[PDB]
Amino acid sequence: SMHSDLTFCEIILMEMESHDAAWPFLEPVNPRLVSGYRRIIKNPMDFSTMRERLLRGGYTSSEEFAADALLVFDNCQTFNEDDSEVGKAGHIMRRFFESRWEEFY
Numbered sequence: 001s002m003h004s005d006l007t008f009c010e011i012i013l014m015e016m017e018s019h020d021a022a023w024p025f026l027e028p029v030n031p032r033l034v035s036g037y038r039r040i041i042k043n044p045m046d047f048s049t050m051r052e053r054l055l056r057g058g059y060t061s062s063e064e065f066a067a068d069a070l071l072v073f074d075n076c077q078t079f080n081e082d083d084s085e086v087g088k089a090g091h092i093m094r095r096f097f098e099s100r101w102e103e104f105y
């Protein structure tokens with residue numbers, strides 16, 4: 001149901017926000033600080049933007065919430081080197097997200 005779907009999304013968002021590897025993903029990247037960011041990343045996303053969407057009602061399905069999560073990780077992979085701490089955190093978070101999503105559904 002919509003209620004059960006959004007309940008699970010709230011759980012997994014909290015689990016992601018509180019994860020050891022969440023530290024790069026808690027706010028938007030600031031393109032005034034990271035000058036070239038919005039030339040490379042055309043669709044920014046982060047956990048705080050997901051929280052705002054969820055708490056309002058902007059998601060109508062669990063899959064829409066999940067698509068934003070995957071976009072966070074895709075953006076991280078596009079912008080950051082795989083050997084960087086941020087890049088490694090993105091890979092960890094993707095694996096965590098996919099495992100929680102799959103074990104549930």
Ligand SMILES: CCCOc1ccn2c(C(C)=O)cc(-c3ccccc3S(C)(=O)=O)c2c1
Nearest residue numbers: 023024025027028029030033034076079086
């Ligand atoms: C001042 C230049 C900062 O450069 C970057 C470039 C990219 N990122 C990312 C991602 C996901 O691409 C994340 C950060 C980051 C890292 C640690 C703390 C805070 C941040 S952030 C989300 O406030 O930019 C971060 C910082």
